[PDB]
Amino acid sequence: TIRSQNVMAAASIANIVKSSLGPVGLDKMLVDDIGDVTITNDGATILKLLEVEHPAAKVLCELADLQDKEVGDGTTSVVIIAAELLKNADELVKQKIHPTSVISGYRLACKEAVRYINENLIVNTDELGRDCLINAAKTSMSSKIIGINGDFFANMVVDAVLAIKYTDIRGQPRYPVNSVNILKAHGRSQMESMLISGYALNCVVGSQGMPKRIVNAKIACLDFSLQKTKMKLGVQVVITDPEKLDQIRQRESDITKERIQKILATGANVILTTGGIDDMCLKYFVEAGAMAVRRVLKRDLKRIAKASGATILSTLANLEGEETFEAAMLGQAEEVVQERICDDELILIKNTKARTSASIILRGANDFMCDEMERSLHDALCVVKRVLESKSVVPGGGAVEAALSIYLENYATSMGSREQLAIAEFARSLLVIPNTLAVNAAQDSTDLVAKLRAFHNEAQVNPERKNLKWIGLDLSNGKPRDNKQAGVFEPTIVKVKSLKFATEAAITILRIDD
Amino acid sequence: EAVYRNIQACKELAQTTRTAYGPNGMNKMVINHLEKLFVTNDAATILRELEVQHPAAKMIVMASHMQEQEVGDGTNFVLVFAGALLELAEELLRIGLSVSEVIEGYEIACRKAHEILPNLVCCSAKNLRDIDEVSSLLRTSIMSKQYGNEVFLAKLIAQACVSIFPDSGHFNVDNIRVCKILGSGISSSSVLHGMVFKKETEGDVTSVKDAKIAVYSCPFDGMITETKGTVLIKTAEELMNFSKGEENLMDAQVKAIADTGANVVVTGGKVADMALHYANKYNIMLVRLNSKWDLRRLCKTVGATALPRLTPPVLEEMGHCDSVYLSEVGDTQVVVFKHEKEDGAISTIVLRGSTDNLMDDIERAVDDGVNTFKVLTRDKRLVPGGGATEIELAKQITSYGETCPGLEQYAIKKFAEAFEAIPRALAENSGVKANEVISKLYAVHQEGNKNVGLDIEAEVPAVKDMLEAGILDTYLGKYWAIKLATNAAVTVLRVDQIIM
Amino acid sequence: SSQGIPQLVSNISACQVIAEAVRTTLGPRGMDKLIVDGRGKATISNDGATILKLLDVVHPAAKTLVDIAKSQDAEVGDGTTSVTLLAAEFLKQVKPYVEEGLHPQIIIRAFRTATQLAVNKIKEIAVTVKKADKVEQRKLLEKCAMTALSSKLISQQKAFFAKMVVDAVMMLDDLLQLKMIGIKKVQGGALEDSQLVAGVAFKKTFSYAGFEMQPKKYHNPKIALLNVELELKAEKDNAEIRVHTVEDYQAIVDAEWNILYDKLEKIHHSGAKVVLSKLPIGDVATQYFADRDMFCAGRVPEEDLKRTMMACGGSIQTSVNALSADVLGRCQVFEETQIGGERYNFFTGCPKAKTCTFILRGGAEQFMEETERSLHDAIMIVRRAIKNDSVVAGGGAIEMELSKYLRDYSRTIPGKQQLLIGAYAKALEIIPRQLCDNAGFDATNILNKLRARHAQGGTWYGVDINNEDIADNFEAFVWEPAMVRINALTAASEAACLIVSVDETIKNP
Numbered sequence A: 001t002i003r004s005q006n007v008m009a010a011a012s013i014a015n016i017v018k019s020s021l022g023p024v025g026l027d028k029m030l031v032d033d034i035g036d037v038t039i040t041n042d043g044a045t046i047l048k049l050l051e052v053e054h055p056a057a058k059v060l061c062e063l064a065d066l067q068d069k070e071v072g073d074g075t076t077s078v079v080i081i082a083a084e085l086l087k088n089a090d091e092l093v094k095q096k097i098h099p100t101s102v103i104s105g106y107r108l109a110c111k112e113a114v115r116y117i118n119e120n121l122i123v124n125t126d127e128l129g130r131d132c133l134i135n136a137a138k139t140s141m142s143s144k145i146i147g148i149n150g151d152f153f154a155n156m157v158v159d160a161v162l163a164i165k166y167t168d169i170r171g172q173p174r175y176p177v178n179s180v181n182i183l184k185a186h187g188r189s190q191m192e193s194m195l196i197s198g199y200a201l202n203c204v205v206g207s208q209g210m211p212k213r214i215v216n217a218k219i220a221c222l223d224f225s226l227q228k229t230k231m232k233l234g235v236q237v238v239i240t241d242p243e244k245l246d247q248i249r250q251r252e253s254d255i256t257k258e259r260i261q262k263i264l265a266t267g268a269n270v271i272l273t274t275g276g277i278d279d280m281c282l283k284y285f286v287e288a289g290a291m292a293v294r295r296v297l298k299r300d301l302k303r304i305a306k307a308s309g310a311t312i313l314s315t316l317a318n319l320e321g322e323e324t325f326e327a328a329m330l331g332q333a334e335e336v337v338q339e340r341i342c343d344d345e346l347i348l349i350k351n352t353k354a355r356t357s358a359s360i361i362l363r364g365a366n367d368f369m370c371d372e373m374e375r376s377l378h379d380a381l382c383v384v385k386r387v388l389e390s391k392s393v394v395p396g397g398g399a400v401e402a403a404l405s406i407y408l409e410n411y412a413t414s415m416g417s418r419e420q421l422a423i424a425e426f427a428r429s430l431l432v433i434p435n436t437l438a439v440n441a442a443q444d445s446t447d448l449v450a451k452l453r454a455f456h457n458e459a460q461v462n463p464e465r466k467n468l469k470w471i472g473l474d475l476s477n478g479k480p481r482d483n484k485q486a487g488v489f490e491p492t493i494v495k496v497k498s499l500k501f502a503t504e505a506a507i508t509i510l511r512i513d514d
Numbered sequence B: 001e002a003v004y005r006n007i008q009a010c011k012e013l014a015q016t017t018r019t020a021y022g023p024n025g026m027n028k029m030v031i032n033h034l035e036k037l038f039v040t041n042d043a044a045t046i047l048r049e050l051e052v053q054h055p056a057a058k059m060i061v062m063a064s065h066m067q068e069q070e071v072g073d074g075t076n077f078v079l080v081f082a083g084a085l086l087e088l089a090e091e092l093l094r095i096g097l098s099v100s101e102v103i104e105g106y107e108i109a110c111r112k113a114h115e116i117l118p119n120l121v122c123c124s125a126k127n128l129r130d131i132d133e134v135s136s137l138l139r140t141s142i143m144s145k146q147y148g149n150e151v152f153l154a155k156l157i158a159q160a161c162v163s164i165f166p167d168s169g170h171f172n173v174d175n176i177r178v179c180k181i182l183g184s185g186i187s188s189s190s191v192l193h194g195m196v197f198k199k200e201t202e203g204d205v206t207s208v209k210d211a212k213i214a215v216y217s218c219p220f221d222g223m224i225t226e227t228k229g230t231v232l233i234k235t236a237e238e239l240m241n242f243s244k245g246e247e248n249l250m251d252a253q254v255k256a257i258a259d260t261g262a263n264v265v266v267t268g269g270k271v272a273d274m275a276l277h278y279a280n281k282y283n284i285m286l287v288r289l290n291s292k293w294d295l296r297r298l299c300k301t302v303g304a305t306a307l308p309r310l311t312p313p314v315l316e317e318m319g320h321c322d323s324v325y326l327s328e329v330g331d332t333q334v335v336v337f338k339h340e341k342e343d344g345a346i347s348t349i350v351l352r353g354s355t356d357n358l359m360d361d362i363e364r365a366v367d368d369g370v371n372t373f374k375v376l377t378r379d380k381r382l383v384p385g386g387g388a389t390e391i392e393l394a395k396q397i398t399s400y401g402e403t404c405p406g407l408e409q410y411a412i413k414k415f416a417e418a419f420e421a422i423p424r425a426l427a428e429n430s431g432v433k434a435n436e437v438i439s440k441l442y443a444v445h446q447e448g449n450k451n452v453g454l455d456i457e458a459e460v461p462a463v464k465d466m467l468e469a470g471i472l473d474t475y476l477g478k479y480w481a482i483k484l485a486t487n488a489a490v491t492v493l494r495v496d497q498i499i500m
Numbered sequence C: 001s002s003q004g005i006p007q008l009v010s011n012i013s014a015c016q017v018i019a020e021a022v023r024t025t026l027g028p029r030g031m032d033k034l035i036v037d038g039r040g041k042a043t044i045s046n047d048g049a050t051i052l053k054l055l056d057v058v059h060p061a062a063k064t065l066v067d068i069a070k071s072q073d074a075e076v077g078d079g080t081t082s083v084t085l086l087a088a089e090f091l092k093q094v095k096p097y098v099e100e101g102l103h104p105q106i107i108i109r110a111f112r113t114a115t116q117l118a119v120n121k122i123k124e125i126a127v128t129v130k131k132a133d134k135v136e137q138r139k140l141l142e143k144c145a146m147t148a149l150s151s152k153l154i155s156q157q158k159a160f161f162a163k164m165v166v167d168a169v170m171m172l173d174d175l176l177q178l179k180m181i182g183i184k185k186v187q188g189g190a191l192e193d194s195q196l197v198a199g200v201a202f203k204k205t206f207s208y209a210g211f212e213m214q215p216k217k218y219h220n221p222k223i224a225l226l227n228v229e230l231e232l233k234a235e236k237d238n239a240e241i242r243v244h245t246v247e248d249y250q251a252i253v254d255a256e257w258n259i260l261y262d263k264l265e266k267i268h269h270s271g272a273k274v275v276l277s278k279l280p281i282g283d284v285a286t287q288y289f290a291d292r293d294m295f296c297a298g299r300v301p302e303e304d305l306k307r308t309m310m311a312c313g314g315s316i317q318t319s320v321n322a323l324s325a326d327v328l329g330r331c332q333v334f335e336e337t338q339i340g341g342e343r344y345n346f347f348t349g350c351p352k353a354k355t356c357t358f359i360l361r362g363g364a365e366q367f368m369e370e371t372e373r374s375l376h377d378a379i380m381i382v383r384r385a386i387k388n389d390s391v392v393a394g395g396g397a398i399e400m401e402l403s404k405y406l407r408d409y410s411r412t413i414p415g416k417q418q419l420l421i422g423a424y425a426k427a428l429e430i431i432p433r434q435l436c437d438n439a440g441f442d443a444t445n446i447l448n449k450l451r452a453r454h455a456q457g458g459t460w461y462g463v464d465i466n467n468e469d470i471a472d473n474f475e476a477f478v479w480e481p482a483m484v485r486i487n488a489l490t491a492a493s494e495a496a497c498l499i500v501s502v503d504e505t506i507k508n509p
């Protein structure tokens, strides 16, 4: 009966997280410390920050966070699936089926799931060739907040991310989120957002005594710095000689002017001021003469250097420079043009040769809906990154779960051993993700999961409806949608690995008997 | 608080009868005072068996019984509508409305509902005495009681009741009665003219078409035997004289056929085969058994004196349905009493049932059928029943509430909500989420169709046009239903404290 | 109790409780139950119909289930257990769903459509071999009864038992309660031989001298149906007479018996020519009946009288009245054969041969009781099967066929009804499960392979109680009639839907 108490504890910890599944999942209260209360609906956060004193919950959550840290998001699904199969296996134990029997059944069901998911319901990284549609659907559902303008986000994302190419083991086509720079802006009509196939920023105006204003055949990757407010102290306070720490400061300013003359002699029109510039220096050198920038984003600086095949650390030991820079920073952008673009004074750089990165400027109207826009773009870019970097995708939502449930029920009806109920009841329990998503979608689960079962049966019993295999639900809807006009998806690797870890957690927690 | 305690009784009664509202409604078992168990759908019989100690419950109970007195169709509508009305009145009093203003608003809203409900009439029973229309009209009441026998009971009620409407002015509902055939299929029931009774009649079948009935209740008695002292008698003269007395009594019967004209007679007391062959030589019939209700109803309808006297027929018992017959339809012999003239041409349904517990339920169904046939007879106008009229009245009352200023506005709004509360209860009974179906139907009623109602037989919240479906409802029945419902509701809300 | 779910779950529990009075008595080898009467009488019966008839049920849900069970008993009699278990398990498998809060009208129409589909599947999959006229089909019914009897595991006399019972039931026996065609069991003797009684007669006569020289082989005896008897010490006259001579006292001893002598003389001269009495008769009375060239049987059971009513065509006399041969029955065979030690007197051959009972003699007690039940079941199944249009494989097989079909249809139908049809199909599994559990408690181990091989391909395979292994329930000659199975499944569905349709129970004490 102590294993049944383990079952009750696991069911409790699963019910804690059930309502948090899915993007429409409700938020959860959890109090690790008396001093503050945390409001989050993220499964990983709620499992990590919360703890349950019962050992079975400890084991289940430890496997869940193993899954989380080793294959990424999905820990909430792992907890829900594992504990539902756990409770259902307890139901079998009340039917006098010994725990080892349902252990063998869960192992066989996991094996058949791994075989079936990889074989019959899968896409070969091409999105069946409909990438310019699934993304169009995906942008719609990844961004509910945007609404009307829609397809333009998709038409930009598809090529702005396909323009990326990382370098890694055998060169997988993973295109990270940082490959595009999000430039929050507003003031214009909410109809467009110019993507920079390359990078963009702003610089000083009027002081542009250099050809960056026009077409540059060759560019640089150079850093920059000018100072008169005590930036560089080569000598310290160690002695009190009253007039002996002001001439080194001014002379460092003069030798920095010598440095920039050594830089401006070579030109190459890409000059970027590094951090540390005091506001006093900012208001000084707009008049005193500076080929500077207003300390543009250092993250953007690093991603620019990566997007130009040359980082200043390869020639200089720091980001300021006192030794003469080598020609390694000679940039190779095909086109650099300054334009009065989007009614702002940006610099526009095309797709720089060698390693490269993308960007976007926002043609927004007012601050807050443009913040909403800056959020939706991040969501869309990150989730499409998930889809493509997965390099293999399973139909998301409840589609794979319902298909696996029906197929495993048939397999159980065609297996014939002591663990025959184990396969079928594993299948029935595995409907918990469709059930939980339907409940969280304000819909009646008994009807939505029913439609999923009916569609998957009709799809895999009569081969005339192969495309009917790809219908699932994740979000509030009146009728479940097909994942070929729609585009809700999950990586097949993370989904199958999360299912494997849920099965393994169930096995480990049922192997503990007395 | 005293008023809320009074309302709680109607609240619990409304929740009790809510499950039984309409087709697909929850069944209920009620226990008779003699522990007899049977399941039923009729809320009227639920109230008949459910004791109601709280006075507000009794208020709603005789509201439903006055509904019985006026028109049988809609008796449960009164109870559930009054319960919803008191729910909304409880909400108003919790808000802080005075009882007087709540009553004023409810009365004015009820008056305008009465004047506007005939504007919701889609059509009328233009073609009575024709099976095609009247069977469909009866279908709604039949399904209201029993959903598994929609059209067969409707058409048998049609073909029966059409035969009891020659006068063209009106007819008496008692002229349609039911008889019992146990252990038989429900589909084997059939209509017959005049009263029929299953149980055997003594003597060979003569069926004189002018048998002016000799009317008695128990003209014969059971077995007895004298005791000379404590111990029994030892002579058969008490039996021989009894047999000869019965023989001479029926000899005087075939004498008194001159002033009585009786080829048939009825009894509740046993007779023997001696009476059998006496009847065979006298060519008469004698029904050996009937129940007390059957005997009494026969006594009134024959319009003749009835008494349990061992006496030959007399002049003061002239039979009404002198044209007597017998039948065997539904593989069961039945005696038949009929009269050829059209006025008061009573007819009966030979109800065939394998289960008495189902048998009295279909008895209640046929009673409501003849009641709604009476409703159509007194007024042919029909209204789109099935929550369509409820939402239409609710929408019109809400339009009034938004257009009429004053303190009664809340009363108007919550009376409209009480009207809305009928289709949501029907949806709860049918097995569909009430909020979504109410919202969908209410949105459909905002434009175009004025008669569309919810589809009970669909799983997803669905709303279908009522006319094309043919489950319409009575105008006058609904009018009186809301009238009595709001009257009882305002009377029970007016009382502030019950007194010992 | 409270409206809706809280009372409906109480109804669920009550139906489970009333199932527990039948749950373990499903199979022919299932557990028997001792039920004690309030009078202090212990009665034993392993058939659910008799158990529920003796058992008083008070809870309204159990009341409705037992009422449906009694209606099925009036229909067939053995289906009581099946219909009760189906109703209880349907309610059990909708319990988690109804507790979830879905409206019971949903499950009402779900069961309605599921059972209509199940009836369609039964009528489609049922098969007929019938054609009983030829000798091959006579011995086919023989092997059916043999499979029903297989507990005996006897040699060819097993087939002889089967042949005798099938012949006795096939000789002009219509569908009836079968009570008149019963059997008796005798000690000693060889089980290979026993008497195919062409009627019914008296169990064991007395040691009177009239028995040994009793007139065997009456050609056409008219029978007398008496209950009042003549015996010693029963009656006497308290007469007092003064002495006048020595020849006078015999008036008193005459008055003690003269009315009895005239009574016996006339009741024997009534027109009957063999007489039966339910109460004990004296040996001296037997000797005066021999003086009437006649014989009497005393202490006859009342079932003898009832079988005389339905078969011999006789009428009760009950006293010295009715000194006429008109109201007296007739027989075509009479004898006495001491069956081993059983001093059985025989009077058989009737205007109606509805009873052609058998008497068993196998020199034991433990075997012939379960033998009585086994022959009862076999002779019942043959007569119900011949009446019906078609027969289907029973013994847990067709329950699985319907379960598989309804699972396949549920998993393809949309809407919330599909979970409910799946629950119905899983609940329909109860009969194989209880057949296995009551037999060897190995329900899961055999049930798994059973369902798997059933889903492998279209077959009528089910559970065999004889070996705890899967056997061809069809062509192993263990059967359930298709029409009877329709009646059982439909009655169980109506009971379940009716009892789960009710929310409140109403009381007015």
Ligand SMILES: Nc1ncnc2c1ncn2[C@@H]1O[C@H](COP(=O)(O)OP(=O)(O)O)[C@@H](O)[C@H]1O
Pocket: B021, B022, B023, B042, B043, B072, B073, B074, B075, B076, B077, B140, B141, B143, B144, B145, B368, B385, B386, B387, B453, B454, B455, B456, B471, B472, B473
């Ligand atoms: N098939 C149907 N679909 C929708 N509504 C129906 C259907 N059949 C009947 N109704 C409505 O359900 C209402 C239920 O009222 P009810 O309480 O059953 O009347 P009563 O109890 O007096 O016979 C009826 O007025 C009828 O209009």
